[PDB]
Amino acid sequence: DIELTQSPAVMSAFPGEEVTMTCSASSSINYMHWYQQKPGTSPKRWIYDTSKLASGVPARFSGSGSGTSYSLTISSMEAEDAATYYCHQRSIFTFGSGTKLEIKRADAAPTVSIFPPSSEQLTSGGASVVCFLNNFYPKDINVKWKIDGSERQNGVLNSWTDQDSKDSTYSMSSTLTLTKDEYERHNSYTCEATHKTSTSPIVKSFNRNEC
Amino acid sequence: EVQLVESGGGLVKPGGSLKLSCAASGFAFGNYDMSWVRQTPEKRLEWVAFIGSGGGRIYYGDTMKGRFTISRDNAKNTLYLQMSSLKSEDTAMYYCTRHYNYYYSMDYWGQGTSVIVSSAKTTPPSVYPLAPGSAAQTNSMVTLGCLVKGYFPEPVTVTWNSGSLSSGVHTFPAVLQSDLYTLSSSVTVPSSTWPSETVTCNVAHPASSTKVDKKIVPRDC
Numbered sequence: 341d342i343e344l345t346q347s348p349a350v351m352s353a354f355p356g357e358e359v360t361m362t363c364s365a366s367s368s369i370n371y372m373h374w375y376q377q378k379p380g381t382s383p384k385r386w387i388y389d390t391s392k393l394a395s396g397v398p399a400r401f402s403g404s405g406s407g408t409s410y411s412l413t414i415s416s417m418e419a420e421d422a423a424t425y426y427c428h429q430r431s432i433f434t435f436g437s438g439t440k441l442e443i444k445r446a447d448a449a450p451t452v453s454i455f456p457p458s459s460e461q462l463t464s465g466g467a468s469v470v471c472f473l474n475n476f477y478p479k480d481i482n483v484k485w486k487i488d489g490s491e492r493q494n495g496v497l498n499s500w501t502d503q504d505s506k507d508s509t510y511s512m513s514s515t516l517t518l519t520k521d522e523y524e525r526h527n528s529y530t531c532e533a534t535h536k537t538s539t540s541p542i543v544k545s546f547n548r549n550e551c
Numbered sequence: 552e553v554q555l556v557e558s559g560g561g562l563v564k565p566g567g568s569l570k571l572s573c574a575a576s577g578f579a580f581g582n583y584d585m586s587w588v589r590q591t592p593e594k595r596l597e598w599v600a601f602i603g604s605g606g607g608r609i610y611y612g613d614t615m616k617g618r619f620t621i622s623r624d625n626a627k628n629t630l631y632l633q634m635s636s637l638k639s640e641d642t643a644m645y646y647c648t649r650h651y652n653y654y655y656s657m658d659y660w661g662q663g664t665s666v667i668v669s670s671a672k673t674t675p676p677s678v679y680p681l682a683p684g685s686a687a688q689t690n691s692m693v694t695l696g697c698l699v700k701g702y703f704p705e706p707v708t709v710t711w712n713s714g715s716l717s718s719g720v721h722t723f724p725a726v727l728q729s730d731l732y733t734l735s736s737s738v739t740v741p742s743s744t745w746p747s748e749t750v751t752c753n754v755a756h757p758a759s760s761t762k763v764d765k766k767i768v769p770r771d772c
């Protein structure tokens with residue numbers, strides 16, 4: 341089975357840089373295509389027959405290669421180029437897994453906000469503690485929960501957004517779900533964000549016994 | 552000009568069947584080879600089936616193993632894909648695509664139609680206001696939220712004050728929790744404007760035909 345692999349799976353660069361991404365085949369093939377995808381929309385033809393640009397594709401893009409190795413190249417990258425690029429060829433069942441190009445920008449620390457479980461959820465017998473970490477960069481960030489002074493790892497679910505289309509920041513939710521009875525057994529809840537913008541964490545907390 | 556419009560997707564139990572349609576416009580549909588491509592939840596893209604312009608040449612992807620049947624009706628400018636004995640691995644977004652020349656790039660794609668294979672049943676979501684309460688804030692800005700828990704299938708759409716609060720919104724991607732979806736949405740407004748000016752989240756779940764509004768009220772301590 342002729343198979344495609346793509347490298348790197350993820351890269352990031354400031355606008356103005358040169359960008360290159362590789363698509364490899366298990367055995368020699370020809371006439372490689374490349375498709376661009378952005379969140380919520382269909383894949384779009386970008387490069388075809390190894391070197392031809394689809395309509396509406398700026399001449400900063402170029403495709404090349406032969407044999408078992410091909411590549412897509414962008415000169416003087418612009419923010420709109422951010423997307424996932426997938427290679428594919430006429431004898432291939434599975435598309436390559438794609439390179440995701442993201443926009444590099446200045447580091448930013450997160451705006452952190454903590455929300456105690458709603459009385460309505462508590463009425464139902466569930467208790468979700470929600471902590472938002474918004475408008476930060478880079479994407480790699482670490483969140484820690486402490487309950488009455490001890491770290492907790494079970495019952496946490498974290499969800500990042502796609503890189504923001506206007507300012508290239510990331511946001512993420514971190515949610516601690518507990519049963520109502522387990523929530524009622526503790527008092528101090530703390531959400532900490534540790535980022536490479538500072539060695540000292542950002543910290544938000546509350547006591548359940550208040551309000 | 553050129554348009555491809557898919558339909559017929561939905562929820563389906565394992566072992567069942569489903570027929571997907573792709574309506575075409577803007578070109579001489581009978582002159583072009585057509586294909587179906589599917590994208591899995593892992594974003595993997597797989598070539599499912601191909602059919603020549605005349606309906607007399609057909610190919611299938613490696614895992615299809617006879618359970619898929621591609622066909623077309625050039626008189627009604629429509630392409631179909633018949634699915635049978637569906638499995639959990641067949642869950643994906645299914646796309647209708649058109650071919651340009653005989654190196655088989657796909658020069659136009661449809662909007663996609665989603666197929667979900669599981670035993671889960673449609674379930675409306677619960678919606679919970681997120682006021683600060685015991686975690687009161689003190690800056691020029693305040694951040695509020697809504698928790699949306701326990702729905703199936705995806706998606707829900709979230710808005711704030713009917714989309715009049717657009718700036719300062721983050722609606723996080725959903726995650727499966729007890730095999731039901733959950734997400735939260737946050738909004739940031741000047742603290743001088745709340746609670747004096749009302750803030751409401753608008754949750755819509757088309758598949759259950761539910762629409763709920765949760766006013767964000769300050770907690771009664």
Ligand SMILES: C[C@]12CCC(=O)C=C1CC[C@@H]1[C@@H]2[C@@H](O)C[C@@]2(C)[C@H]1CC[C@]2(O)C(=O)CO
Binds near residue numbers: 433608612613655
């Ligand atoms: C160019 C090709 C063979 C020559 C032809 O008249 C038309 C096509 C288009 C559809 C292609 C096909 C073969 O390459 C095998 C493919 C890729 C198939 C789509 C699914 C496929 O059957 C496979 O996935 C086999 O692995």
